[PDB]
C-alpha cells in the first residue's frame, strides 16, 4: 500500500511529455527506477537515478528519456521525446526501500502510455 | 432590546461521493478478445490484480 501512482497522456509519436511518479510523502530511498513494460514481451527497464548521483539507462532508449529527481516534492520526472511505436506499454515507478538490507519495491502502481497516430 | 429569534445554518449543496478509481486498465481484453485459447487440459489463467 503505502505509496501510489496514477496519471499519464496518451500522445502521437515524436512528442514530448512528462512522466511522474505522484508522491506519497517523504521516503527513505537510494535509487527511483522507471521501468516498462508491454503484453507480449519480457518486462523491460528503462532508466534508474541514484540518491547519490548515479544515472542509468538502458541501450534502446538513448537520446529520447532525461530523468530528473525532485527533492522537496521527492518525485522522479522523466521527459521523453521523439518517440516511436515501441513505447507503446504501461510504465511503472520501482522503488529501494531497504528491508533488511533493500528490496520489496513498490512498482505495483502502474501509468498506461500509448504513443500512436491514430 | 435585541433578541434572538431563531438559528441559521448552511445545507450542503451536493453529495459527492468518491473511491481511489488510480489503477491501470485491466487485463480483460487478452482473455475475452483472445485470438486463440487453450486446451480443456492445457489449462490457461491468467492473473488480475
Ligand atoms: C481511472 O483513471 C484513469 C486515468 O486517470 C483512466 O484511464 C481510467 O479509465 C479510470 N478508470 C475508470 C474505471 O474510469
Ligand atoms: C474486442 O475487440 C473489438 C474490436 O477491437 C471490440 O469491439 C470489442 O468490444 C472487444 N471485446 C470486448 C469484450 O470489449
Known amino acids: 500500500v503505502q505509496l501510489q501512482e496514477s496519471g499519464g497522456g496518451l500522445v502521437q509519436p515524436g512528442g514530448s511529455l512528462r512522466l511522474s511518479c505522484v508522491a506519497s510523502?517523504?521516503?527513505?530511498?537510494?535509487?527511483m527506477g522507471w521501468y516498462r513494460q508491454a503484453p507480449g514481451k519480457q518486462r523491460e527497464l528503462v532508466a534508474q537515478?541514484?540518491?547519490?548521483?548515479?544515472?542509468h539507462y538502458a541501450d534502446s532508449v538513448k537520446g529520447r528519456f532525461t530523468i530528473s529527481e525532485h527533492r522537496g516534492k521527492n518525485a522522479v520526472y522523466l521527459e521523453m521525446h521523439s518517440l516511436k511505436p515501441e513505447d507503446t506499454a504501461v510504465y511503472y515507478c520501482?522503488?529501494?526501500?531497504?528491508?533488511?538490507?533493500?528490496?520489496?519495491?513498490?512498482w505495483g502502481q502502474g501509468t498506461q502510455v500509448t504513443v500512436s497516430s491514430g | 432590546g435585541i433578541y434572538q429569534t431563531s438559528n441559521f445554518r448552511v445545507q450542503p449543496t451536493e453529495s459527492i461521493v468518491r473511491f481511489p478509481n488510480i489503477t491501470n486498465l485491466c487485463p480483460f481484453g487478452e482473455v475475452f478478445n483472445a485470438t486463440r485459447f487453450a486446451s480443456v487440459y492445457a489449462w490457461n489463467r491468467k492473473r488480475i490484480s
Open positions: 537515478i541514484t540518491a547519490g548521483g548515479d544515472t
Open positions: 520501482h522503488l529501494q526501500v531497504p528491508f533488511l538490507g533493500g528490496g520489496y519495491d513498490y
Open positions: 510523502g517523504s521516503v527513505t530511498f537510494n535509487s
